[PDB]
Amino acid sequence: SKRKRKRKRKSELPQMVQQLNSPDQQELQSALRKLSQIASGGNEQIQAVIDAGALPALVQLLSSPNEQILQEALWALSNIASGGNEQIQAVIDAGALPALVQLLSSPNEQILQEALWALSNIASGGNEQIQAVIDAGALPALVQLLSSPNEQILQEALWALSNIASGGNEQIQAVIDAGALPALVQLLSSPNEQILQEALWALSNIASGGNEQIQAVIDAGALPALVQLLSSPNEQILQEALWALSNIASGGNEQIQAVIDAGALPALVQLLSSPNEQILQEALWALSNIASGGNEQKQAVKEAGALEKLEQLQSHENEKIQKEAQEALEKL
Ligand SMILES: [Ca+2]
Ligand SMILES: [Ca+2]
Ligand SMILES: [Ca+2]
Ligand SMILES: [Ca+2]
Ligand SMILES: [Mg+2]
DSSP, X not given: OOOOOOOOOOOOHHHHHHGGGOSXXXXXXXXXXXXXXXHTSOHHHHHHHHHTTHHHHHXXXXXXXXXXXXXXXXXXXXXXXXXXXXXXXXXXXXXXXXXXXXXXXOSOHHHHHHHHHHHXXXXXXXXXXXXXXHHTTHHHHHHHGGGOSXXXXXXXXXXXXXXXXXXXXXXXXHHHHTTHHHXXXXXXXXXXXXXXXXXXXXXXXXXXXXXXXXXXXXXXXXXXXXXXXXXXSOHHHHHHHHHHHHHHHTSOHHHHHHHHHTTHHHXXXXXXXXXXXXXXXXXXXXXXXXXXXXXXXXXXXXXXXXXHHHHHGGXXXXXXXXXXXXXXXXXX
């Protein structure tokens, strides 16, 4: 009866590849601009760039001392990695990952941003593609960028970590093992709404894993902060706070109890009186997961005043809320 949620975020062509070897800098940079423009479009267009064999040339252009070339080579591969799971694999096979991981140590803010956006597109594929990013050694660098004073780099590192944490339990464990949780818990107190929202996204995906992955979040100290975000006037921060707690509540009775002990129930029951259907639906989802525990957890929910409001919510105009309230009462 427990629900878990994850969220991910994303012509003479064979001669154009040879044009990258041209001594004329206007010629090699024009071809590189065209190649990147084709890959920005649909999946079929990206596949044509693969067939022309641009990937080994683009991967070699990742060591170019020319910043204008490197910038466009990164933007082209980023567009190539925005495609399908198989197209992303082609970028990995080309040897992009060791070069991109080394590009994370670049003191060039433009290049660093361009590389993070490429790694985030590779991490938005399948679990085979995410594990490739992990095995490349991207995680120690991404966790280090969580302490960066550059708000843009910090946001783009969070983008990559949320995508890595959107994979399997082995992938989420890797993010935990890399030491991401203390840094993410620190970002929950941040006055920057953009940074807080990205850290809420990453933690919610870590919380979507197994009981052990959920416990890591609890031991990290995320709950007091998370319960306080349930009092936020910001609808975006609130939806993400409810998203993280629902995934923590989808764990075991020991995890569900930690949620109760953190003072979530008075806040969750209050959110049931919201005229905002999205907030009410997520508050319901979070309660439905708590009600999926033992008698000790069910008693806490009953004593919080949930029964009264859940009974009243069976008459709601929204059929999705009518259903959610009937499910939660049955559990109780
Ligand atoms: Ca240079
Ligand atoms: Ca700054
Ligand atoms: Ca602010
Ligand atoms: Ca309404
Ligand atoms: Mg530059």
